[PDB]
Write a protein that binds this ligand. Structure first.
Ligand code: THK
Ligand code: CL
Lengths: 99, 99
């Protein structure tokens, strides 16, 4: 679909049998989702920001359905203040920026 | 242009006479650029991140060329690691998300 950017680009994602709201973010390398447990083993990952680090868990071949489009990739789960779809899942649904 | 997201969407912008490389970021509401000496009156601003805040200089009707498209808007200037051009200027150049 065409998403203009006057409002935050929030969409629905179905992941782990849950329907959640997430931000399509071209400035994120990785996808970061609010806490939940998924199927599989997880690798600890410590992600950074401005005055520190946050520990998150990395799950690896998770099916996600972003606005009906199925995509498979790595998801990081942890205490994020908003669900963020990073470029790793945006490339999978063939999303481009256009102007 | 139609830009794909396999690599970081970095573009050449022109602001305050100097050329810069910046990240097209749909997740960020604002445009935050590195220290440059912009001519103009400014206000201090705080932008929060992981466990803290950083102070920047808010400038308000700045002309910014982004891949030849001129846009006018607010730019926050300060110790950013990464030059962010967010939604406030992406709407101005007619940038969309499409899939
Ligand atoms: O924009 C920032 C900023 C930039 C400049 C200035 Cl001056 C101030 C603030 C402040 C916000 N962070 C967000 C980190 C993005 C990632 C992440 C998402 C959620 C989460 F809980 C943890 C990490 S997304 C994947 C890895 S980090 C970047 C720099
Ligand atoms: Cl941060």
């Amino acid at each position: 679909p065409q998403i203009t950017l006057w409002q935050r680009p929030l969409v629905t994602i179905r992941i782990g049998g849950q329907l959640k709201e997430a931000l399509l973010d071209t400035g994120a390398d990785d996808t970061v989702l609010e806490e939940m447990n998924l199927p599989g083993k997880w690798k600890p990952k410590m992600i950074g920001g401005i005055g520190g680090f946050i520990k998150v868990r990395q799950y690896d071949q998770i099916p996600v359905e972003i606005c009906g489009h199925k995509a498979i990739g790595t998801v990081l789960v942890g205490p994020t203040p908003v669900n963020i779809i990073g470029r790793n899942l945006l490339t999978q649904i063939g999303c481009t920026l256009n102007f």
